[PDB]
Amino acid sequence: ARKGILGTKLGMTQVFDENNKVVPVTVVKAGPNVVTRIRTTERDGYSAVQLAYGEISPRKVIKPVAGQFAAAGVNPRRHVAELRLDDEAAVAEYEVGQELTAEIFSDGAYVDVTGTSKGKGFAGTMKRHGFRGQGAAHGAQAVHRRPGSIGGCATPGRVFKGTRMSGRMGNDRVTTQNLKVHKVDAENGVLLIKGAIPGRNGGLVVVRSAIKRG
């Protein structure tokens, strides 16, 4: 049902259509995910599947994490992340220790990709919330590019929690919805997506069946 997969962005590229067009595409190497736990509603509170993927040297991995993986019966994975199900139908088809691969996706199915955004560091208001720059001549006095007035005056006599002003932006979870899939790899776990997904080369991206369209 609400399947899911983790994967990495290693670059991004464009392909040349049989439709005869040209489409930019991002390289999301979807290594084979491994199910290391089950979320049965009756005994946990909901339905969902635990997922992990990757490779880490055993001395690089924490002892409790290694023990948990061993109890799971799968090799160590670089990180851990689990996706939710929508019904026990898909639940019954998942089983601890099972290996999951990119095969699960049939071409033509819209997808959703989400992951940490780029690291922008602390950002000025103009860049952050798309303000407009003041008059840079005609006599600005060290105010060429600052926010400006900030609220009412003695009424409300405050500054209205929620006002969009300077604050370190980027580097947080973000999702892009309704991205057309373009080519599903089988032999070496690769997946090509139109557009430019958020993240960074070598970043971590989680893909799932698209929500809006299907």
Partner: protein, 122 residues
């Protein structure tokens, strides 16, 4: 990439040489006009005995721009200087020709006559 107060070359036999961009039609606070957009231009200088004298206000369809214009295969095409064409309510050009190449997007835009009588379409 045609904006308010932008100079335009005329690519037609009306008798117009330089015109001003009045605006980009069909958009609330619309901000750019590239090839294919029906925009409104005023005549700044024209042929003495031309068909339209300066100061008239007429609608134009931009055809030639110095900004690249995309097309399906990622094609980006740059021209030497912006060029417009004079047109009226029926969307029939007020001239009878075009000098210099033009862009295929006009065919899509359904201004069949322009591209049909153009010297060459690219």
């Amino acid at each position: 990439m045609i904006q308010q107060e932008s100079r335009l070359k005329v690519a037609d036999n009306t008798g117009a040489k330089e015109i001003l961009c009045i605006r980009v039609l069909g958009g609330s606070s619309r901000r750019y006009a590239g090839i294919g957009d029906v925009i409104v231009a005023t005549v700044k200088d024209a042929i003495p005995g031309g068909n339209v004298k300066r100061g008239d206000v007429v609608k134009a369809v931009v055809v030639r721009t110095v900004k690249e214009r995309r097309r399906a295969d990622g094609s980006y095409i740059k021209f030497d200087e912006n060029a417009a064409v004079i047109i009226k309510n029926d969307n029939d050009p007020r001239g009878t020709r075009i000098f210099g190449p033009v862009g295929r997007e006009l065919r899509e835009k359904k201004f069949m006559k322009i591209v049909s009588l153009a010297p060459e379409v690219l």
